[PDB]
């Protein structure tokens, strides 16, 4: 798994994994600000584009 924004896979305890696909994102690369790893489901922007 690699971060969509910065393209690195380091600091994996900070690295969110998408519940709809194999993609990821560091909480510190997310905008708007994300202080912590959320408890519930997280969907990347590519999965959001499939919603209705
Ligand atoms: Zn990143
Ligand atoms: Zn996704």
Swiss-Prot record:
PTM statement from Swiss-Prot or TrEMBL: Deacetylation by SIRT1 in late S phase enhances pRNA-binding, allowing de novo DNA methylation and heterochromatin formation. Acetylation is high during S phase and declines to background levels in late S phase when the silent copies of rRNA genes are replicated. Ubiquitinated. Deubiquitinated by USP21 leading to its stabilization.
Localisation per UniProt entry: Nucleus, Nucleolus
Cross-link (Glycyl lysine isopeptide (Lys-Gly) (interchain with G-Cter in SUMO2)): 33
ZnF PHD-type span: 1-50
Tissues of expression: Expressed at moderate levels in most tissues analyzed, including heart, brain, placenta, lung, skeletal muscle, kidney and pancreas.
SS bond list: none
Subunit structure: Component of the NoRC-1 ISWI chromatin remodeling complex at least composed of SMARCA1 and BAZ2A/TIP5, which regulates the spacing of histone octamers on the DNA template to facilitate access to DNA. Within the NoRC-1 ISWI chromatin remodeling complex interacts with SMARCA1; the interaction is direct. Component of the NoRC-5 ISWI chromatin remodeling complex (also called the NoRC nucleolar-remodeling complex), at least composed of SMARCA5/SNF2H and BAZ2A/TIP5, which regulates the spacing of histone octamers on the DNA template to facilitate access to DNA.
Record remark: domains: The bromo domain and the PHD-type zinc finger recognize and bind histone H4 acetylated on 'Lys-16' (H4K16ac). These 2 domains play a central role in the recruitment of chromatin silencing proteins such as DNMT1, DNMT3B and HDAC1.
Family of this protein: Belongs to the WAL family.
Function: Regulatory subunit of the ATP-dependent NoRC-1 and NoRC-5 ISWI chromatin remodeling complexes, which form ordered nucleosome arrays on chromatin and facilitate access to DNA during DNA-templated processes such as DNA replication, transcription, and repair. Both complexes regulate the spacing of nucleosomes along the chromatin and have the ability to slide mononucleosomes to the center of a DNA template. Directly stimulates the ATPase activity of SMARCA5 in the NoRC-5 ISWI chromatin remodeling complex.
Name used for this protein in its record: Bromodomain adjacent to zinc finger domain protein 2A
Residues of the full protein shown: 1677 to 1728 of 1905
